[PDB]
Amino acid sequence: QSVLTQPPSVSEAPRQTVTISCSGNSFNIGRYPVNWYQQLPGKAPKLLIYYNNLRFSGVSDRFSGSKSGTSASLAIRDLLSEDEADYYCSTWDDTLKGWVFGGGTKVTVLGQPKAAPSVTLFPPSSEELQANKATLVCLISDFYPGAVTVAWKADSSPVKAGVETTTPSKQSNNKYAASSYLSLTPEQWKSHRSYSCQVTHEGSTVEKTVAPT
């Protein structure tokens, strides 16, 4: 994880307000001012707020920033569709001796009801196992807003090696889907009791499980 912690996603209806937190420790935000960057879909980051609370040239007064202790905050009021973007906080960290950024927060201006994802977890095909390979495929669909967090386990052991996950993509029906893969050896696949794909969306997690048996 980044040394600055941001929520992956915030959202609200048009004209409402969202707030994005960015928390650090005594060696970064606890000592240094925070800047915020806005990155529109398909564009580069641009400077939004600097020195905790100053708006950069061109920036709407609907954006405001603050800082307290080891946390900083960005608030966007009177939301418009054009505000949909990823927002990054940034400061200096004295432990790492360099510039650091939060993990980024996607803002969604709700255009439809929130929807929980359907999750389907496919085990390795017999064909792939015959080729001496194994891939678990966790497919995630029909959710909104378009942000999920995927975590894999082998029995009770978190697995990060061999995991690849896509950024959510819009479906034909205007909801989102995403995919995540766990690459394993046949030996790994058959030597654990079960594997699970856990998907967190809007702060609740559902789990699907598969077993070699």
Place this chain on the structure above:
Amino acid sequence: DGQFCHKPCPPGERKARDCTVNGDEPDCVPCQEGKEYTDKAHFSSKCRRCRLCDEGHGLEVEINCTRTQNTKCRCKPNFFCNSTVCEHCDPCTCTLTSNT
């Protein structure tokens, strides 16, 4: 100024000297407690001078300057000020911030 500093100094400190393009980056050194301060991180080689609480202005010190916090003044006993900022206080004609 700090254009050639790569690393900031935290509140209470300052660059030992100006950064330059060829010199080893100067270390941070502490402001003189009671004399100078920096309440915010910065890339400069200067601290800021602690303000005074002048009696002739009807002021006295409420909190002494610290390396990270400029002196805090208040009205003297029997003086008051209305505004949130008070270049000076006048004699009660009453809280230190109110008149009776």
Place this chain on the structure above:
Amino acid sequence: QLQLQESGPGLVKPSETLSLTCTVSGASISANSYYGVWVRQSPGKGLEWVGSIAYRGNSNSGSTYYNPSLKSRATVSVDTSKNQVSLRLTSVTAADTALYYCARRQLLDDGTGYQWAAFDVWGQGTMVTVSSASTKGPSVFPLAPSGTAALGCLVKDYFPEPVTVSWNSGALTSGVHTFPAVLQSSGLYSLSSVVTVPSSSLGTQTYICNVNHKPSNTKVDKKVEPKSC
């Protein structure tokens, strides 16, 4: 005023050196001083500062400072006659794949004597992929469905992009979603395609994913049928 533009090769091989250029327009980086940085972003991920140069035009020299996590693999330099800042990254691996941005660091006033640093002007970004791969057609494996059910095809280990998928030769479109590809640490891509169909159909209707990969001149039709247990 100031504008920045990155450029470089989009594909680099592991162990090899990655080189990028950042071209400054609308001002001269040798007129006074110029503080340049590089910041990268792995696809779909967050931002990471790479390194910096503080450059003084009148002595034609700058000092550099790098992110320690790059273990000295990064160097930044200036070519004043071209108004360019450059990045060089040695011994690259899959983990070095990213969108590379250049930007200016400016000390900005707060209006009360104080200044703080921010990256106030950014380039558009250049994408860099690190992979040892040669052209290679995919292996296709069925994702077998276990009152609706999801079934799909896994398209494993190909290079380069792109692959296209249709189902039943394009007759089947409702409920179909084909995902973007992931790039694996092996330097090969995979993607999946999925469709939700009525569980009652699995017996009668046949489902075939047609996978094309023009670069390798391969084309695979995979029938996807109910798991035999």
